[PDB]
Amino acid sequence: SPLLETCVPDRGREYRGRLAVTTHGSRCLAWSSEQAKALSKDQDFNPAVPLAENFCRNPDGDEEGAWCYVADQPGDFEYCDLNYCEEPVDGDLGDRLGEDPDPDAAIEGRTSEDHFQPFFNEKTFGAGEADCGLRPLFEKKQVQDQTEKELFESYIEGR
Amino acid sequence: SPLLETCVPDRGREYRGRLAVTTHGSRCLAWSSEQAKALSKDQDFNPAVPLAENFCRNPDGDEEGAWCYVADQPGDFEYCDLNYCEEPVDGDLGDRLGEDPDPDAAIEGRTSEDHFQPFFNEKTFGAGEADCGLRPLFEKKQVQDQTEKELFESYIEGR
Amino acid sequence: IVEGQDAEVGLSPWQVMLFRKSPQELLCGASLISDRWVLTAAHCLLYPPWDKNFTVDDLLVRIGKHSRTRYERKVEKISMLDKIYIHPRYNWKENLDRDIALLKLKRPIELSDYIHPVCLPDKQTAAKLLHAGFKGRVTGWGNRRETWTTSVAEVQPSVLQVVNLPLVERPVCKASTRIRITDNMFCAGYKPGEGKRGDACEGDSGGPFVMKSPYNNRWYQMGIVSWGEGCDRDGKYGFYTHVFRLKKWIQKVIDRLGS
Amino acid sequence: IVEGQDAEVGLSPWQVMLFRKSPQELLCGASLISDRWVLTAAHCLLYPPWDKNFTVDDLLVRIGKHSRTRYERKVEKISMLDKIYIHPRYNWKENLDRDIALLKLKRPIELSDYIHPVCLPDKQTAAKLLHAGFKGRVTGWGNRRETWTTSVAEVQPSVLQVVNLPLVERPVCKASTRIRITDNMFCAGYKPGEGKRGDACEGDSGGPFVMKSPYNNRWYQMGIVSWGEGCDRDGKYGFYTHVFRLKKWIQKVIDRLGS
Ligand SMILES: *C[C@@](*)(O)[C@H](CCCNC(N)=[NH2+])NC(=O)[C@@H]1CCCN1C(=O)[C@H](N)Cc1ccccc1
Ligand SMILES: *C[C@@](*)(O)[C@H](CCCNC(N)=[NH2+])NC(=O)[C@@H]1CCCN1C(=O)[C@H](N)Cc1ccccc1
Ligand SMILES: *[C@@H]1O[C@H](CO)[C@@H](O[C@@H]2O[C@H](CO)[C@@H](O)[C@H](O)[C@H]2NC(C)=O)[C@H](O)[C@H]1NC(C)=O
Ligand SMILES: *[C@@H]1O[C@H](CO)[C@@H](O[C@@H]2O[C@H](CO)[C@@H](O)[C@H](O)[C@H]2NC(C)=O)[C@H](O)[C@H]1NC(C)=O
Known part of the structure; x- marks a missing residue:
């Protein structure tokens, strides 16, 4: 269509349109519903543009584009054929940050510990964090395992 | 799954399995149902294997796998995730030939006409075909098109 | 283009302006293959993910035009629809495979210098x-x-x-x-x-x-x-x-x- | 491998083995991350197009092993599941985007020289x-x-x-x-x-x-x-x-x- 709307930018992030149908060609569920408000009950959404009724939105900032929720079970959502501008980014491995967890409260700043630092509370996570990674018959027993050496030579480089 | 059924060759051509689902995770219509009986009625289903109930079958020799009908309208069909063998063949342009139309009845052989051949009956197809491809203000008037020539040296090639 | x-x-002369009557706006092109049938791309009439579902009573055709606007009083030919035949397996859900339609005009148009198949x-x-x-x-x-x-x-x-x-x-x-x-x-x-x-x-x-x-x-x-x-x-x-x-x-x- | x-x-020692109880069959693997929660690939528990969808009663876990067969009478720790959390947007329709799950043991397993997070x-x-x-x-x-x-x-x-x-x-x-x-x-x-x-x-x-x-x-x-x-x-x-x-x-x- 020539006389259609303009080219949707920023991978549909700031999208505030009204399309309520998926690429699969399916309906769409009410952002705030008995189904969709339980699936959302775990993620890390963001404002930018509201979750108006049931129109495709990109709340989580999903880089593949705006989507609808199609049903209730996990993975039952689907993307929208929003007609985005440019092809998506290709963040070279650790090129895309992923500003990770806080000590159960956003923004560290006053962050100090012994030499490890847990991030799971202990009450629920259980036990073993404090000394994870340290295999008993090796790191604790100060003996190296057969190929560790090889894993190591990679790090610092051979060229 | 490791212990799973073997590989699916020929892109699922002669596949007689019983999976009633689609990659979009949906149902699958019975091949002889009202809906599915219609959509197919006008295509070209070769045998290879039976159309068994509503199991993913590749009845058209679709070289992208086997599939289901998910509804009744055009396009309401979906491919199945059969877990095929090797990478599908990519024929060089005309490389996927296509043994197109007979004089409405199977095979040509006993076929000879002036210089064209109305592969369309006249009754249902209507008027035209005979003098098709010839523009009133050009070829019929033996006058050349501004770029006809450019389109021509193409077949001649500059190498 | x-x-x-x-x-x-x-x-x-086989060029076909395919547009909707209301609101009036150009939709797609197409081609005249006979005096009564016209061949077109399917995603002009149908594409659910967008809300594209025009019926016969939704869009008219214009055989023989030139400027994409100006009633060409001596040459064009605005007619009505009849068919709209999409492919049963028109893959609109993934890659527009078989994107091919088959419009049929209400009454066989009058051939001409400017309208030829x-x-x-x-x-x-x-x-x-x-x-x-x-x-x-x-x-x-x-x-x-x-x-x-x-x-x-x-x-x-x-x-x-x-x-x-x-x-x-x-x-x-x-x-x-x-x-x-x-x-x-x-x-x-x-x-x-x-x-x-x-x-x-x-x-x-x-x-x-x-x-x-x-x-x-x-x-x-x-x-x-x-x-x-x-x-x-x-x-x-x-x-x-x-x-x-x-x-x-x-x-x-x-x-x-x-x- | x-x-x-x-x-x-x-x-x-965090190498977990996750396998369904009847029939006894090795499904996938996983990692112990603490004494009570386990991480594993979500597709191991659910994959709609192949009709995969196990629930808790369907499969148990096996921590602390070596041979993928032979009850290692001393060192193992067979244990049942409780939770099973799959990601709400584990894109199983297209490309296993977020293939993450998260099982929970029924009762906190005990650590050992062979069982460690x-x-x-x-x-x-x-x-x-x-x-x-x-x-x-x-x-x-x-x-x-x-x-x-x-x-x-x-x-x-x-x-x-x-x-x-x-x-x-x-x-x-x-x-x-x-x-x-x-x-x-x-x-x-x-x-x-x-x-x-x-x-x-x-x-x-x-x-x-x-x-x-x-x-x-x-x-x-x-x-x-x-x-x-x-x-x-x-x-x-x-x-x-x-x-x-x-x-x-x-x-x-x-x-x-x-x-
Ligand atoms: C409907 C036609 O006017 C239009 C032709 C555009 C062709 N462009 C170039 N450069 N030759 N078709 C389309 O726009 C098709 C229909 C659906 C949207 N679409 C696209 O080509 C999208 N830009 C991408 C696309 C989406 C889904 C499936 C395939 C392609
Ligand atoms: C389920 C895991 O055991 C297994 C990992 C083995 C894959 N191969 C390598 N070299 N890592 N995963 C799979 O087999 C997944 C399950 C879904 C299909 N699949 C595939 O790898 C397909 N071969 C490709 C694929 C299909 C659908 C969606 C994404 C990828
Ligand atoms: C496009 O609109 C037409 C309107 O004619 C829809 O046709 C109906 O579709 C339903 C559901 O498939 C059928 O049960 C009816 O019998 C159809 N009626 C007619 C007159 O065809 C069509 O389904 C719509 N297509 C899409 C993709 O929305
Ligand atoms: C996997 O199995 C569970 C059964 O334990 C299914 O859960 C039910 O799903 C339906 C449809 O989404 C819901 O209406 C029920 O309330 C669910 N029951 C429970 C106890 O959760 C789940 O849908 C299955 N997944 C698939 C893809 O079939």
Whole structure:
């Protein structure tokens, strides 16, 4: 269509349109519903543009584009054929940050510990964090395992 | 799954399995149902294997796998995730030939006409075909098109 | 259509403006294959993910025009619809596979100098012309550039525009996009080195991709403008419905419509 | 694990084996991350198009082993599940985007010299080690080769197996298949030039791709075995779930559990 709307930018992030149908060609569920408000009950959404009724939105900032929720079970959502501008980014491995967890409260700043630092509370996570990674018959027993050496030579480089 | 059924060759051509689902995770219509009986009625289903109930079958020799009908309208069909063998063949342009139309009845052989051949009956197809491809203000008037020539040296090639 | 010139009055009499009656707006192009049937791209009438579902009573046709606006009082021919035959397996959910429709006019239009039909290829000429390197044309009132600053008004050709694009090796085609390309799809455009731009831009869908024969010099319809990424982007190629490979269907559809 | 060598008794003590009770069948693997919660590839519990959907009563877990068969009377710890959390947006329709799950033991297992939790990376160490060229380890009892003449029996490693695999450049990553590689995945494995073979094949899903931190010399889990096209295929690089990105979810689930 020539006389259609303009080219949707920023991978549909700031999208505030009204399309309520998926690429699969399916309906769409009410952002705030008995189904969709339980699936959302775990993620890390963001404002930018509201979750108006049931129109495709990109709340989580999903880089593949705006989507609808199609049903209730996990993975039952689907993307929208929003007609985005440019092809998506290709963040070279650790090129895309992923500003990770806080000590159960956003923004560290006053962050100090012994030499490890847990991030799971202990009450629920259980036990073993404090000394994870340290295999008993090796790191604790100060003996190296057969190929560790090889894993190591990679790090610092051979060229 | 490791212990799973073997590989699916020929892109699922002669596949007689019983999976009633689609990659979009949906149902699958019975091949002889009202809906599915219609959509197919006008295509070209070769045998290879039976159309068994509503199991993913590749009845058209679709070289992208086997599939289901998910509804009744055009396009309401979906491919199945059969877990095929090797990478599908990519024929060089005309490389996927296509043994197109007979004089409405199977095979040509006993076929000879002036210089064209109305592969369309006249009754249902209507008027035209005979003098098709010839523009009133050009070829019929033996006058050349501004770029006809450019389109021509193409077949001649500059190498 | 991008980087292409204006078409000579009468360069392509089979050209079909397909537009909706209300609100009045240009939809797609298409082609006249007989005096009563017209061949077009399917995603002009149907594309659910967008809300595209026009019935016969929604869109009219204009055979014989030139400028994409101005009632051509002496030459055009606005008629009514009848059919709208989409393919049962038109893959609109994933890659627009088999993007081919089959409009039927209410009453057989009156042939003319300005309104003449195009031909469907045959297995012989077919094998012959579809070689990577040969050229073909594509006609359309579709957008000149790919964008505008404001209002697409500022990018819509005044009159019918034309461009000749050369066929490209399927292998390169694949390479062009993630969008799965099918047996019946074929890309045409110039490569990054070659130095000649041009392409069917948005709004050109339906218009035919046609070549001329080196035997019997008649014009044949090899494709249907279907899809693409942007318009005239170096590194990409326009994709077209391979009309030939779907030729058998057409025969089924038409020839079973009565006697 | 293809082209890998046997694992040493005691090597990876977070290596969990997740298998369904009836029939007794090895499904995938996983990592112990604390005394009570387990991480595994979501597709191991649910995959709609193949009709996969186990519930808690369906499968048990087995921590602290070596041979993927033979009750190791002393060292193991067979235990039932309780929770099973799959990600709400584990894109199972298209490309296993977020192939992360998160099981819970019924009762906290007890630690040992063979049963010990791996570490969930943090932003800092996650920065320093995530660089193309460094290696890691993907363990498991998944198939040795990628095919067999008759009976997959003949391609099932006896003891555990291990292989050290190197991280590739996201560019070449994207470049190995039209399957949309997501922001949160990462392909690892050797290059066509490079000479060395090795790859986590079928059956390997869930098994972790752990990396040793020179600083603090602890073991971290960067990824999880998720998807790949065949095994050790010259050209194709195996993919893993980016656990670091998804870590924020893991937090959001685990501490919401009551206290
Ligand atoms: C309907 C036609 O006017 C139009 C033609 C555009 C062709 N472009 C170039 N450069 N030759 N078709 C389309 O726009 C098709 C229909 C659905 C949207 N579409 C596209 O080509 C999208 N830009 C991409 C796409 C989406 C889904 C499936 C395939 C392609
Ligand atoms: C379930 C895991 O055991 C397994 C890991 C083995 C994959 N191969 C390599 N070299 N890592 N995962 C799979 O087999 C997944 C399950 C879904 C299909 N699949 C694939 O790898 C397909 N071969 C490719 C694929 C299909 C659908 C969606 C994404 C990828
Ligand atoms: C497009 O609109 C037409 C309106 O005619 C829809 O046609 C109906 O579709 C339903 C559901 O498939 C059928 O049960 C009816 O019998 C159809 N009626 C007619 C007159 O065809 C069509 O389904 C719509 N298509 C889409 C994709 O929305
Ligand atoms: C996997 O199995 C569970 C059964 O335990 C299914 O859960 C039910 O799903 C339906 C449909 O979404 C819901 O209406 C029920 O309330 C669910 N019951 C429970 C106890 O959760 C789940 O849907 C299955 N998944 C699939 C894809 O079939």
